[PDB]
Amino acid sequence: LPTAQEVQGLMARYIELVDVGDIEAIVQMYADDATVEDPFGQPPIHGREQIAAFYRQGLGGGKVRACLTGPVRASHNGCGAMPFRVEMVWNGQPCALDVIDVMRFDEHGRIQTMQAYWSEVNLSVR
Amino acid sequence: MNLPTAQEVQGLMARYIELVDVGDIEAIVQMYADDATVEDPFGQPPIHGREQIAAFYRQGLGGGKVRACLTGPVRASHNGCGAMPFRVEMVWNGQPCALDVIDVMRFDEHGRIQTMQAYWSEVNLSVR
Numbered sequence: 576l577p578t579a580q581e582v583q584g585l586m587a588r589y590i591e592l593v594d595v596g597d598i599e600a601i602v603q604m605y606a607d608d609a610t611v612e613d614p615f616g617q618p619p620i621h622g623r624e625q626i627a628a629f630y631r632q633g634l635g636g637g638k639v640r641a642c643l644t645g646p647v648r649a650s651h652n653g654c655g656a657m658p659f660r661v662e663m664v665w666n667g668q669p670c671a672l673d674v675i676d677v678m679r680f681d682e683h684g685r686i687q688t689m690q691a692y693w694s695e696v697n698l699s700v701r
Numbered sequence: 702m703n704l705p706t707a708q709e710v711q712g713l714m715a716r717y718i719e720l721v722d723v724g725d726i727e728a729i730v731q732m733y734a735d736d737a738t739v740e741d742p743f744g745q746p747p748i749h750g751r752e753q754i755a756a757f758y759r760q761g762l763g764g765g766k767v768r769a770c771l772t773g774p775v776r777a778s779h780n781g782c783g784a785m786p787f788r789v790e791m792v793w794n795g796q797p798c799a800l801d802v803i804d805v806m807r808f809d810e811h812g813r814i815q816t817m818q819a820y821w822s823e824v825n826l827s828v829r
């Protein structure tokens with residue numbers, strides 16, 4: 576499994592890819608059988624095509640920005656958690672969303688699970 | 702209460718940090734379900750039940766002064782879970798150090814913590 580230092584680098588790279596909006600590069604970071612729960616509480620998304628569709632829908636228009644708001648926390652069993660802020664426009668209202676992602680990596684450094692914690696209580700109008 | 706709403710999760714998890722900061726072990730243990738599990742750090746074997754959880758917090762908080770504070774908002778779901786970023790300050794080698802942590806908590810139908818997972822390792826420890 577990736578080391579704690581490697582998890583920090585992978586999760587930071589993921590945020591960099593979200594921020595520039597490269598959907599294909601993001602999808603490549605996921606394992607074949609990965610699941611995404613975003614927001615956590617909703618049914619998982621499974622499969623490369625469906626994960627790509629989710630990022631295409633979320634990031635498609637451009638105008639999404641994302642940045643870490645504190646350090647990546649990493650374990651020694653290939654998992655980590657990170658806090659970040661997403662900036663977007665929701666029907667002409669510029670908004671920000673505070674999120675924590677929890678990720679579990681496989682032995683190849685790919686994302687096996689992703690769980691995103693947020694709800695409407697984490698939304699703010701700018 | 703019942704299963705906490707997202708707003709209630711934010712309040713419960715913020716209170717937990719206040720109780721860590723002041724070091725009220727009994728009040729912390731009362732927030733946990735009787736059969737709760739703690740994984741701290743995540744990756745180590747779970748701790749089961751209030752007796753073992755009390756012992757863990759008394760070992761961690763019972764000695765030198767520990768301070769804890771949120772470093773950003775609590776993220777909450779609609780299914781009784783949340784995640785929060787915070788910083789713990791304590792002493793190591795006679796000097797102050799800081800540890801950055803993210804806890805993930807799942808609450809039960811009575812508003813008590815059923816599982817807690819704490820994400821951190823030595824890469825999150827800092828000094829000077």
Ligand SMILES: C[C@]12CCc3c(ccc4cc(O)ccc34)[C@@H]1CCC2=O
Nearest residue numbers: 593613633634639661663674676691
């Ligand atoms: C999908 C989304 C944009 C990106 C995004 C959101 C929420 C959680 C995320 C978690 C991620 O790891 C990456 C991107 C998002 C927003 C919710 C509403 C929206 O437009």
Ligand SMILES: C[C@]12CCc3c(ccc4cc(O)ccc34)[C@@H]1CCC2=O
Nearest residue numbers: 721741761767789791800802804819
């Ligand atoms: C135990 C501890 C103080 C408190 C604490 C630590 C780590 C994770 C935590 C998670 C919590 O939800 C509450 C308290 C801690 C530190 C690790 C070493 C130390 O001194």
Ligand SMILES: [Cl-]
Nearest residue numbers: 645646772786
């Ligand atoms: Cl932080």
Ligand SMILES: [Cl-]
Nearest residue numbers: 644658773774
């Ligand atoms: Cl934050």
Ligand SMILES: [Mg+2]
Nearest residue numbers: 734735736809
């Ligand atoms: Mg019960």
